[PDB]
Write a protein that binds this DNA or RNA. Structure first.
Lengths: 117, 101, 110, 139, 156, 49, 57
RNA sequence: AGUACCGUGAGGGAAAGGUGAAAAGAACCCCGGGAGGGGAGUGAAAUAGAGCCUGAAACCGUGGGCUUACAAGCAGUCACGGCCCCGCAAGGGGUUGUGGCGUGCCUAUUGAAGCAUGAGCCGGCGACUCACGGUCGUGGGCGAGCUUAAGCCGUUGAGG
RNA sequence: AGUGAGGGCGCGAGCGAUAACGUCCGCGUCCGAGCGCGGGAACAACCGAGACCGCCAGCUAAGGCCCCCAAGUCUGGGCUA
RNA sequence: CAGGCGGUAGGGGAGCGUUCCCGAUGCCGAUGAAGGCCGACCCGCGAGGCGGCUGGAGGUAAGGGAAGUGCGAAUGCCGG
């Protein structure tokens, strides 16, 4: 018989109240469109953690180009350098070092120019 | 000190800190266990030189424990196209407390 | 708290009443008085009086250096409304609800 | 890894312009006004160099001369999109012709914006650069 | 609940009050009639006497093998009054942590066999798998009758 | 107080509505509500006769 | 006939009600007694500058 | 509540349940024409105070934090930097300026951002069942297997 | 149990004016119904490519590397201007 | 080791709360039933505990059974 699903939904909904952080006035408490706006945000963070990869890709990309070239020769060149390069060829730091240990870059370099030849 | 060896994808460049990185849950089957990462990117406070030899020489090791875990965050799969379902971020590693060398 | 200036079911009105207090707060009985009194428009006495009780509650059972009582924190609230209905051609129901006003204004000491 | 941007690191520089050629010199001046070249190089600024160039005028033409018209269509609509040729272009506003190159590649409203801010020149002969009393880095 | 008081029509299902609906006091709204109605009913269930009794049996069997009080004999209560009946209990070893189904025509047996706890008052050759396994232990009198009845169950 | 239906017995398919997330149940309009449609068999009846 | 579309939030409502805003009433003291007097005026007390001709009864 | 109220009549046909445990439900003093407002007493509470239990969402309000006048964007949101916050640090909070990338959801569509549509905002209601026939499955009793209508015992009413 | 009508592209015949993001049939792919990523500016179906979930990891398609924006204003030999 | 894991119509599997029936009331409880208000431990989720505040009395499941049930959404229905 009975079935005052009330209890339930009042709940499901406040849940939603939180789901909704405190977005742009109206799509904030916006129950409905709130939820919606959310689905959005969802697929969004989606895209987000998804590609942040390429994000860095570039990040360093440039930071480093910045340094390698600043020194003597861009990517085809420098890169190819670490390339010919033997039991030593890393990346997720080329930047790092270029930065932190000026020497570090200056020489990773030196050898590298040679690395190519 | 700040040295570079890296693992599972370059998890490194550090000193003695609980710098938690990736799940190499193998010696993890024991709390603060120890283990080495083959260098590559040998460089410490003045003496800076080669990742080849990093690939082939000294290694470093840690004493580690703990894990981390599911780190909240969720992801809902929907398409304007007419649908939506979603879940929580499950990730971790027993984390490392750094052993010099 | 302090000198309470508030009251119920008097059908004046939101916004407007809010305007009044808007301008009268800040200062004390002296100044806000002069304005509430000689500045034109409705609310005039509603406001003023609310002031009055506020002040009485005040030097009466809060007391404090009477002279320096200045409206501190305050503004208004509107409760239900009278739901009245008028005529508007080809019959049809044209509805209205006049604001039965309540005021939430407090006199503070300083 | 991390690597956060320093703090108020100011550098300016004097560019010849004169004799140099249109576009290409632009490509340059251009990226020059980096935001990426000196450390912590990126979104929120970085270099870009408060760069200033003179003899802005006396630039060499991409061999085109006439057949290159800038526009100014503030136009109260059905007005004029004011077509103008490089000649007079410079004749009165050379610093600007270059300009159009410059903006040409400069991007981002608020940011690029700020950069043109740190992007100044004068087809004046140089004295202008003088007016810009400050340091005078150079190329 | 319409038929009779079905509110014929009230909305000019015409095309202007914007709204749809021709019938008032209509299903789909305000305290009116509701979907797949809560029809008065009953759960008959002619569950084959075969295994039905087969089981009543099986339950009797295990419940008993663990704790079986086929009395055939008993007596402690003025013919069977409460207090004295109780004494009996203490005798038959029946205490608190125990619930037993008292079953059989010893009407003085039922007569004193009330009391919410310990005992449940069943003086009839009225049995049932449930009450069976649900009542801690079976305790019953005219067991000549019973065991034989169960047998009748056994071979018709 | 324990003997839950052995194997499967208990409600096996009183599947409610149309799908956890979504829902709708069948085809297109041709089978709406007052839609207990072309029943048992159309051309099959042709056979019949 | 031309009923808008929605309401650019309380936001807008304000934008307006807002530039609107309620200013205050001009006053100095009685050229005669005390209290508030708006420029050229007298009142239920002093009431003058040259002949109260006003107040008290 | 078949009374309010619409219809000429025929006829249609609401809403509103609870103060508290008991009335002890408000002497009396104070602004006021009054309401109503501060006190005293009530009392276990009166944020239990007469439409007065529990008394949430919506919307409007008083104060505080961050934020904002060369800005073009559903949204957002990944990043980071400036604030302020709990913080032992780890760091966790809220807040965002700079930038990267981002056509809103439902229905019916070859086909949608929709300029096609539904969509005003909150809340409670709001829609694949029941009876048999069957029918296929498959969980369970014996192969010949099972029992209606009834007669009978029936707090439990016990099943036969 | 569901669609029982759909469109696009390529090739092969209709037709149509050898017109149309036309409509007819067929081989294939397609796109819906996954076809959510790259992409060509941005563009349901044109070349690349199948996303169960992570990574402040690296190799690649197509197609790109003066700049706006990752990537040689590479080298080599020409030919237009 | 495969090995695969966009995917509505549609078909199969597996869980979720939800108010009742036994609940073989176990009781739990004025050092709160309950609904509520807030929260960086549980869940692959539907949900969970648990902590803190309200709030005046309920509420209920170990295991299983019974269903007016879980809803933007229908120019919806009733009230703001």
């Amino acid at each position: 018989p009975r079935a005052k699903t009330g209890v339930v939904r009042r709940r499901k909904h406040k849940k939603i109240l939180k789901l909704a952080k405190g977005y742009w006035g109206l799509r904030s408490k916006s129950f409905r469109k709130a939820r919606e706006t959310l689905f959005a945000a969802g697929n969004y963070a989606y895209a987000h953690r998804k590609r942040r990869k390429r994000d860095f890709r570039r990040l360093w990309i440039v930071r480093i180009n910045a340094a390698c070239r600043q020194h003597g020769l861009n990517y085809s060149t420098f890169i190819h350098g670490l390339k010919k390069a033997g039991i030593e060829v890393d990346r997720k730091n080329l930047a790092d070092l270029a930065v932190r240990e000026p020497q570090v870059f200056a020489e990773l370099v030196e050898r590298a120019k040679a690395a190519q030849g | 000190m700040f040295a570079i060896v890296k693992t599972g994808g370059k998890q490194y460049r550090v000193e003695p800190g609980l710098k938690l990185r990736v799940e190499k849950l193998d010696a993890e089957p024991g709390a603060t266990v120890e283990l080495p990462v083959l260098l590559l990117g040998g460089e410490k406070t003045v003496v800076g030189t080669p990742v080849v030899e990093g690939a082939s020489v000294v290694a470093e090791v840690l004493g580690h424990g703990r894990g981390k875990k599911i780190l909240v965050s969720k992801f809902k799969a929907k398409v304007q196209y007419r649908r939506k379902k979603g879940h929580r971020q499950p990730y971790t590693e027993l984390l490392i407390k750094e052993i010099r060398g | 708290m302090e000198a309470k200036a508030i009251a119920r079911y008097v059908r004046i009105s939101p916004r407007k009443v809010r305007l009044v207090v808007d301008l009268i707060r800040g200062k004390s009985l002296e100044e806000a008085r002069n304005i509430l009194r000689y500045t034109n428009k409705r609310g005039a006495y509603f406001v003023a009086k609310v002031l009055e009780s506020a002040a009485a509650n005040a030097v009466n059972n809060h007391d404090m250096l009477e002279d320096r009582l200045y409206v501190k924190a305050a503004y208004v609230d509107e409760g239900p409304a009278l739901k009245r209905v008028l005529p508007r051609a080809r019959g049809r129901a044209d509805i209205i609800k006049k604001r039965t006003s309540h005021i939430t204004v407090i006199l503070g000491e300083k | 890894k991390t690597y956060v941007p320093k703090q108020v690191e100011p550098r300016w520089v004097l560019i010849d312009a004169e004799g140099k050629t249109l576009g290409r010199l632009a490509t340059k001046i251009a990226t020059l006004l980096r935001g990426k070249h000196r450390p912590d190089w990126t979104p929120n600024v970085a270099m870009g160099d408060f760069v200033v160039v003179v003899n802005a005028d006396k630039i060499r033409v991409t061999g085109k001369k006439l057949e290159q018209k800038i526009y100014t269509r503030y136009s109260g609509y059905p007005g004029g999109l004011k077509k103008i040729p490089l000649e007079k272009m410079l004749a009165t506003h050379p610093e600007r012709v270059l300009e159009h190159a410059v903006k040409g590649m400069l991007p981002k409203g608020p940011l690029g914006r700020r950069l043109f801010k740190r992007l100044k020149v004068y087809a004046g002969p140089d004295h202008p650069h003088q007016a810009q009393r400050p340091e005078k880095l150079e190329v | 609940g319409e038929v009779a008081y079905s509110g014929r029509k009230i909305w000019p299902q015409k095309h202007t009050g914007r709204a749809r609906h021709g019938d008032i006091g209509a299903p789909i709204f305000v305290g009116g009639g509701v979907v797949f109605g809560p029809k008065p009913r009953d759960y008959s269930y002619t569950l084959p006497k075969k295994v039905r009794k087969k089981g009543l049996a099986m339950a009797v069997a295990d419940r008993a093998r663990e704790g079986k009080l086929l009395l055939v004999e008993a007596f402690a209560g003025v013919n069977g009054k409460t207090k004295e009946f109780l004494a009996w209990a203490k005798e038959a070893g029946l205490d608190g942590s125990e619930s037993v189904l008292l079953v059989t025509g010893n009407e003085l047996v039922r007569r004193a066999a009330r009391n919410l706890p310990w005992v449940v008052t069943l003086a009839p050759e009225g049995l049932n798998v449930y009450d069976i396994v649900r009542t801690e232990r079976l305790v019953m009198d005219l067991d000549a009758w019973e065991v034989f009845q169960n047998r009748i169950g056994g071979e018709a | 107080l324990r003997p839950n239906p052995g194997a499967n017995k208990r409600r096996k398919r009183v599947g409610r509505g149309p799908g956890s997330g979504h829902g709708k149940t069948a085809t297109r309009g041709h089978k709406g509500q007052k839609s207990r449609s072309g029943g048992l068999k159309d051309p099959r009846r042709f056979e019949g006769g | 006939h031309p009923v808008p579309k929605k309401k650019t939030s309380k936001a807008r409502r304000d934008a307006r009600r807002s530039h609107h805003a309620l200013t205050p009433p001009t006053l100095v003291p009685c050229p005669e007694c005390k209290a508030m007097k708006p420029p050229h005026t007298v009142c239920p007390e002093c009431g003058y500058y040259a002949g109260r001709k006003v107040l008290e009864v």
